[PDB]
């Protein structure tokens with residue numbers, strides 16, 4: 001049941017990896033993976049009904 | 061995710077090895093491998109533009 | 121066994 | 126699994 | 131070479147300028163790295179850089195100094211020594227950021243009857259010690275930065291005791307390389323020796339060196355040039371010999387970022 | 399365009415500078431020629447040229463002048479109007495030779511209740527007439543070259559009668575385009591009109607024009623910019639209206655040859 | 667492909683010589699060191715060389731925890747006139763001399779930092795009272811975050827600053843930190859200023875220290891005893907050990923030859939004579 | 950909000966960007982223990998009035 005993931009190696013001395021095994025039945029007990037996703041800001045930065053083309057007039 | 065490397069065996073009693081597993085996501089947490097490289101001293105000992113041939117006159 | 125990411 | 130150096 | 135070519139006879143051409151020499155001791159490329167422009171993979175400011183090319187990457191001759199039996203040594207900082215040199219200086223003061231490499235050509239001829247040896251050292255981050263024992267790190271910008279005239283080394287540390295109006299200048303002791311380390315070890319820095327019987331010049335090609343890809347040329351000097359008499363000047367049986375030392379330095383692969391109005395520094 | 403694009407709404411970006419406009423009347427490219435660098439087939443000085451690129455080819459804003467009911471007109475010369483503009487001016491005064499094209503953007507907004515029309519003319523070799531009827535061709539370098547402040551047109555020729563100490567300046571009469579030809583014909587030169595009800599700017603892209611591939615920028619002006627009120631300023635029922643006129647000009651594809659020490663001209 | 671623990675080159679057997687080849691003659695003016703080996707100037711035998719440079723690799727040279735500071739804290743009686751001492755230290759390797767000198771063989775460096783904390787305590791007054799086991803809080807306060815004014819004020823909440831709660835008498839505390847510089851390498855030497863003095867500005871206004879870059883380079887460690895005031899006063903010391911792991915270094919320098927005198931390269935009068943008397947022709 | 954980048958209004962060079970937003974992810978922004986309360990208890994002599 002071992003999970004093997006890679007580290008993003010910052011300062012250097014191949015891919016360096018690390019190992020994780022969950023010891024508990026409840027996912028609440030698990031550490032955080034930090035393997036997170038990003039998304040586009042659009043729902044906040046461009047919430048407009050008609051798609052904005054930045055080279056065009058915002059108002060036409 | 062286990063890394064298996066050999067030891068340079070100094071005093072003796074095959075290849076003797078040792079095992080390493082990284083426990084953390086951040087490479088900063090890792091121990092030092094000590095698996096290091098050497099380089100030629102030339103950038104400091106022979107920084108000259110024209111390659112030195114030691115049997116030849118340094119000045120010609 | 122082992123998963124790999 | 127295992128890497129070997 | 132069988133067609134006459136020699137280690138001792140060189141010609142260097144940059145922009146509209148040429149240096150010749152008939153008594154060189156080869157030439158040095160610091161850390162084996164030739165100067166280069168900043169690569170896109172290492173780039174940092176995003177604006178289009180200014181790259182003046184032949185307008186600034188050319189040989190500039192600084193004021194000639196004089197070597198005598200009492201000379202303890204001289205020092206200059208780069209880019210500071212070139213801050214007033216033609217379009218290099220202009221491009222420097224108009225931009226926030228700038229990086230540059232250099233060809234440093236130190237000139238000093240004499241005769242087969244003179245003797246003496248100048249150690250010519252190029253030091254990355256050549257931090258020099260101050261004149262005070264009441265305050266550390268107190269050398270003023272004005273005194274740290276002499277421009278083309280440079281500064282000199284002394285054989286004696288002498289502390290500034292005027293606490294009301296402190297001198298705020300360096301007190302660089304020669305056998306301590308002006309920074310608290312022994313001069314005999316300065317050879318780990320890129321160097322050449324002008325030993326009068328052997329050669330009449332030193333040539334050091336310096337890459338841009340820094341912990342950053344580009345930086346403030348006006349706030350920070352990347353390289354220091356230190357010239358010290360390893361063996362004193364001597365001639366025939368004269369008590370007061372003199373021979374001149376001339377520095378000619380060329381910026382190489384220099385580029386600038388962050389264009390605005392010109393910087394007008396307080397230099398006195 | 400169905401995606402909103404207009405002849406009246408433009409954005410110009412050169413170097414670290416951007417101009418926007420929402421009331422343009424298209425833009426003019428003089429003689430249909432976009433600025434270019436000097437081609438090897440037409441080249442003449444053989445030394446590597448300096449080409450400062452973004453450091454000089456950027457928008458420089460000159461001092462703003464004021465349009466009133468009594469204004470007879472204004473004039474500027476290129477490169478003279480830019481001689482003190484950042485690294486363009488520096489590159490100009492450090493080199494014997496230089497060539498350059500320009501984007502000229504004249505700015506003047508008002509309101510739907512004002513009226514008036516400025517003719518903005520770019521004239522190649524804009525030779526202007528002198529103030530004397532005792533001596534021809536006697537306008538001094540200093541008066542011929544006002545720098546960024548420019549000069550003005552007059553509705554009246556008035557001869558300099560001080561023969562002891564002559565003024566030695568131009569006396570450019572407006573309906574004679576300051577050169578003895580009728581202003582109504584100035585439209586054969588590349589031009590735009592700022593007619594306040596229609597547009598608030600003029601944009602002229604000027605190629606380098608000369609009988610030579612490259613020349614002395616310090617001795618010779620290639621282009622003249624002449625702005626004249628074709629229809630006078632008027633507003634509501636005010637007797638003394640005023641609106642500002644601002645010039646912003648960008649050098650384009652400029653290159654320089656013959657590097658030496660800097661030219662220090664007698665300008666007063 | 668050559669590694670730090672590889673054996674150095676074998677000596678090859680070499681015999682007598684009489685030629686125009688002149689290895690012994692050179693010219694140090696060029697800036698180069700003559701790359702000679704014994705077989706160039708004497709007769710040699712064949713030797714199979716087993717020695718290696720493993721312990722002098724940059725990593726191995728630095729692979730040790732060095733003490734960089736000693737922080738003092740206490741926990742007094744509640745009745746004291748003097749405030750409960752909590753400690754504040756600006757992080758640096760320049761308060762002590764040994765690791766500093768080793769790092770300064772080089773101009774620039776990159777490394778991950780391992781910090782280990784050894785904590786000791788004692789009684790001060792010739793009392794007979796006891797104290798229950800202490801817990802210490804070591805808070806990292808990066809440049810900008812609020813520095814504690816009192817042992818118990820709101821900043822010790824640490825919602826975002828990293829803190830270590832250390833229990834007395836347990837194994838010494840330890841954390842790692844990545845290469846955190848704002849430059850591509852740490853500068854052991856900065857020949858410059860953080861401000862340009864402008865002519866149009868006053869001298870005071872354009873002034874700054876020689877060789878100093880960011881005023882608060884790496885922030886602060888603040889340490890406190892978390893336990894409330896106790897009738898018998900206990901004083902503790904936190905010794906901080908720094909080890910540079912995963913290290914790279916650039917541009918070699920001559921080592922510090924005269925005593926350190928402040929964070930810069932300055933030297934004090936009276937310390938400038940490291941070398942001792944020895945006669946030129948005396949072994 | 951106007952989605953502009955430097956190349957929209959000035960002349961730019963090519964830069965290979967290495968920086969990431971790893972430390973400002975929601976998880977990383979909150980990945981710290983924060984003090985939320987201090988509870989007080991005691992154990993007195995049996996003879997106490999309180």
Ligand SMILES: CCCCCCCCCCCCC/C=C\[C@H](O)[C@H](N)CO
Pocket residue numbers: 757758759779781804805806828829830841843846847851852853854883884
């Ligand atoms: C809970 C404890 C956290 C401790 C966090 C410490 C973070 C700060 C790391 C400091 C790095 C210091 C590096 C050494 C000095 C530099 O080399 C030079 N002064 C040049 O920049």
Ligand SMILES: *C(=O)CCCCCCCCCCCCC
Pocket residue numbers: 001002021022023024121122
């Ligand atoms: C998947 O996990 C199969 C491999 C097992 C590897 C060794 C497990 C190490 C000890 C985990 C103990 C159980 C935790 C409750």
Ligand SMILES: *C(=O)CCCCCCCCCCCCC
Pocket residue numbers: 002004019020021061062081082083084122126127
């Ligand atoms: C690769 O690691 C797969 C083999 C796993 C071997 C046993 C791992 C031993 C326990 C590691 C625990 C996880 C560390 C957070």
